[PDB]
Amino acid sequence: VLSPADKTNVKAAWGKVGAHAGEYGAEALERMFLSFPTTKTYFPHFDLSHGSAQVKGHGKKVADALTNAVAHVDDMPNALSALSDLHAHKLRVDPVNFKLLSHCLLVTLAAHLPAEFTPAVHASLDKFLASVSTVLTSKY
Amino acid sequence: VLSPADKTNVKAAWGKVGAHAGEYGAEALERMFLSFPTTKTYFPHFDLSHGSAQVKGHGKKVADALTNAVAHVDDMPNALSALSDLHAHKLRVDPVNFKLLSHCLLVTLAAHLPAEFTPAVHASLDKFLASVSTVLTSKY
Amino acid sequence: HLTPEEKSAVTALWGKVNVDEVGGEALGRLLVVYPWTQRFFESFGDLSTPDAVMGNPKVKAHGKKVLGAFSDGLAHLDNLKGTFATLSELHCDKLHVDPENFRLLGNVLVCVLAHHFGKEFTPPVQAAYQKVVAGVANALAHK
Amino acid sequence: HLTPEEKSAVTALWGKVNVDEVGGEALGRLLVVYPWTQRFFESFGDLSTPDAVMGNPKVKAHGKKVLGAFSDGLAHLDNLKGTFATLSELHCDKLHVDPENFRLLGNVLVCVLAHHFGKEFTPPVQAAYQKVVAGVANALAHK
Numbered sequence: 208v209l210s211p212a213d214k215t216n217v218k219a220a221w222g223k224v225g226a227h228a229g230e231y232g233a234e235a236l237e238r239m240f241l242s243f244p245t246t247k248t249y250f251p252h253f254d255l256s257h258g259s260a261q262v263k264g265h266g267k268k269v270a271d272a273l274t275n276a277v278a279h280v281d282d283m284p285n286a287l288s289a290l291s292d293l294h295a296h297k298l299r300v301d302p303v304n305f306k307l308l309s310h311c312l313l314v315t316l317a318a319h320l321p322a323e324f325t326p327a328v329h330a331s332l333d334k335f336l337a338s339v340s341t342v343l344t345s346k347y
Numbered sequence: 348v349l350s351p352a353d354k355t356n357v358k359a360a361w362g363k364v365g366a367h368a369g370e371y372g373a374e375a376l377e378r379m380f381l382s383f384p385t386t387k388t389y390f391p392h393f394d395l396s397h398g399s400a401q402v403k404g405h406g407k408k409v410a411d412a413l414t415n416a417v418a419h420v421d422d423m424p425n426a427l428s429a430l431s432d433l434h435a436h437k438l439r440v441d442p443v444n445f446k447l448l449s450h451c452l453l454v455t456l457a458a459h460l461p462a463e464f465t466p467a468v469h470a471s472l473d474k475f476l477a478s479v480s481t482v483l484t485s486k487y
Numbered sequence: 488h489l490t491p492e493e494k495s496a497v498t499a500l501w502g503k504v505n506v507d508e509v510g511g512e513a514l515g516r517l518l519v520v521y522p523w524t525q526r527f528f529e530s531f532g533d534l535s536t537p538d539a540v541m542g543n544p545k546v547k548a549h550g551k552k553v554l555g556a557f558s559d560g561l562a563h564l565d566n567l568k569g570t571f572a573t574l575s576e577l578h579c580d581k582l583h584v585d586p587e588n589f590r591l592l593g594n595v596l597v598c599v600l601a602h603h604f605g606k607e608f609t610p611p612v613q614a615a616y617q618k619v620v621a622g623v624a625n626a627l628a629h630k
Numbered sequence: 631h632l633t634p635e636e637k638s639a640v641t642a643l644w645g646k647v648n649v650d651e652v653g654g655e656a657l658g659r660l661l662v663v664y665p666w667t668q669r670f671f672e673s674f675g676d677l678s679t680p681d682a683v684m685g686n687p688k689v690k691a692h693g694k695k696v697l698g699a700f701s702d703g704l705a706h707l708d709n710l711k712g713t714f715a716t717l718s719e720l721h722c723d724k725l726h727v728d729p730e731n732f733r734l735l736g737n738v739l740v741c742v743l744a745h746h747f748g749k750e751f752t753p754p755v756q757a758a759y760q761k762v763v764a765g766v767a768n769a770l771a772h773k
């Protein structure tokens with residue numbers, strides 16, 4: 208459960224992503240695939256080499272989904288319902304993989320926005336990503 | 348996130364507990380303390396012997412809380428705010444311990460209510476207990 | 488590992504286990520309670536409802552193999568690592584099963600034993616089984 | 631289990647690490663991001679705001695010791711299981727630190743390295759460090 212302070216922290220930090228949406232999304236995916244090779248098993252249909260067109264395109268979709276989550280932070284189950292059906296019902300993604308991607312997202316943000324990535328904001332981002340993760344792994 | 352089916356299963360099953368709630372709470376605690384002895388460190392002030400009235404008394408309180416959670420299953424962060432403050436802010440309970448108690452509650456229910464502990468009900472009780480646990484380990 | 492009285496209690500209940508059903512019920516319950524695990528069992532066919540899962544003959548037969556592996560654990564308590572070496576290799580290299588799931592299955596087996604044995608599955612008997620299932624999980628995760 | 635290319639990448643980055651700061655930063659973030667971990671360090675006094683934590687001298691001092699142990703591992707990658715042999719006995723027996731927390735600290739350290747190094751903390755560099763921190767966390771959990 209996110210605090211009011213968590214919600215404002217996430218808004219200000221994620222808002223700084225802006226035009227860098229696809230870029231940071233693609234980088235987080237690349238970090239996940241290289242750091243945690245078993246996650247590649249969900250993408251056998253992808254070219255997963257550095258700079259791949261498919262990973263770029265997908266990174267943008269992931270990052271835009273999180274942007275949509277931030278915009279609907281108080282109504283995430285409703286806003287992410289189709290994405291929950293995709294991940295939980297169709298893809299059956301092991302919840303461990305959300306932890307790995309969420310970690311790689313935090314790493315990406317820290318590498319890129321060191322001013323934003325204070326300990327308090329790190330904490331709020333981690334809670335935010337865990338909540339998005341719970342939504343996408345549940346079916347309700 | 349709980350499905351509509353999840354809420355109805357939990358209501359039905361926890362309803363079967365009734366007068367035994369206190370009793371089941373105490374046994375789950377006892378199961379937890381014996382199977383996972385590191386959890387005892389949160390209770391240095393308790394008599395933790397088998398049959399302990401202190402454990403019995405606390406089991407009733409845990410059970411009563413779950414009943415209240417069921418009653419406000421759509422409103423749990425609000426309904427459980429006092430307990431969140433206690434467990435997350437004051438006691439700083441490691442979230443691992445909630446998984447242990449939840450498991451021990453499921454074991455107790457299986458041992459006592461075998462006709463009611465169907466696979467479907469087991470799944471819904473698990474997701475419900477996970478949700479209560481998240482609320483109690485959250486600072487919001 | 489286990490105290491002698493833990494061993495005799497554990498062994499006494501294990502000898503009474505419904506060998507045809509218990510493993511199947513644990514695997515079945517894992518698939519129902521933790522549905523992402525169904526990803527690993529696409530070759531089993533229909534797993535789309537709890538009834539379908541629990542009655543599926545591949546679930547029942549594989550469950551019996553899983554139970555035999557736990558039994559082999561109980562037969563080899565001072566050498567779980569060696570017993571499960573080949574199985575650990577399989578689950579890691581070929582199957583790509585995250586190890587947290589080994590702990591989930593072990594705990595589901597405990598729930599099924601409680602379900603089948605009722606008040607005979609006492610807190611101390613549970614405590615001993617928890618040691619067994621954690622040992623099997625650790626051993627499977629070793630590689 | 632690190633390759634020579636991974637060992638070279640890890641070693642090169644670690645040479646540039648501020649040894650008096652990074653450990654305190656990682657421990658401080660652990661206590662802020664995962665506030666239950668504060669339970670183990672009540673002797674530190676005020677840990678009640680992110681600012682109180684991050685500026686606590688006991689956090690800074692203990693984190694230096696923590697960092698020093700990672701540096702040990704980094705100079706002995708092929709034998710982390712003996713490099714951390716004593717420390718493992720401490721956290722399990724006396725301190726009762728649940729193992730999930732070792733992995734959390736390792737990942738918080740990764741976050742700190744990314745924060746400090748920015749674009750230099752490349753995806754392959756991270757991958758190598760993930761092996762290091764998993765190695766350390768495994769080695770520490772051994773008892």
Ligand code: HEM
Pocket residue numbers: 246249250265268269272273290293294298300304305306308309339340343
């Ligand atoms: C922050 C967590 C995540 C978010 C926000 C997210 C978001 C998305 C989005 C927006 C899509 C595209 C759906 C569409 O185009 O209609 C998608 C597809 C997908 N996601 Fe995720 N996802 C997350 C985590 C994961 C994880 C952890 C995995 C597995 C490692 C995963 C595997 C996939 C796969 C396999 C697809 C289908 C890709 C394709 O065929 O094009 N996702 N995800």
Ligand code: HEM
Pocket residue numbers: 386389390405408409412413430433434438440444445448479480483
């Ligand atoms: C769903 C799980 C849980 C529920 C519903 C629950 C509920 C409660 C309730 C109702 C109280 C009494 C608060 C009051 O007087 O108003 C309480 C106190 C407490 N709980 Fe929990 N709790 C849960 C899990 C845990 C776990 C996992 C631990 C640690 C292993 C824990 C440790 C405590 C402690 C130490 C107290 C204070 C006891 C005392 O001083 O009397 N709880 N809990």
Ligand code: HEM
Pocket residue numbers: 524527528530552553556557574577578582584588589590592593623624627
């Ligand atoms: C933790 C206790 C577990 C034990 C004792 C166990 C035991 C076994 C055994 C004995 C086999 C048969 C190997 C063979 O045919 O040679 C096997 C295969 C398998 N296990 Fe497990 N396992 C466990 C956990 C898991 C989990 C958690 C999953 C996934 C959720 C899993 C997925 C599989 C799969 C996919 C196979 C291959 C089945 C096939 O298609 O033939 N196992 N396991």
Ligand code: HEM
Pocket residue numbers: 667670671673692695696699700717721725727731732733735736766767770
């Ligand atoms: C996983 C990486 C970790 C490493 C390398 C590590 C290393 C160390 C070292 C070297 C010491 C001895 C410091 C000294 O007194 O000279 C120590 C002590 C300690 N560690 Fe850790 N540790 C780790 C994780 C954790 C975690 C996750 C916790 C709990 C949240 C924890 C709690 C403690 C405590 C309570 C002490 C005793 C410190 C004192 O009061 O003097 N450690 N650790």
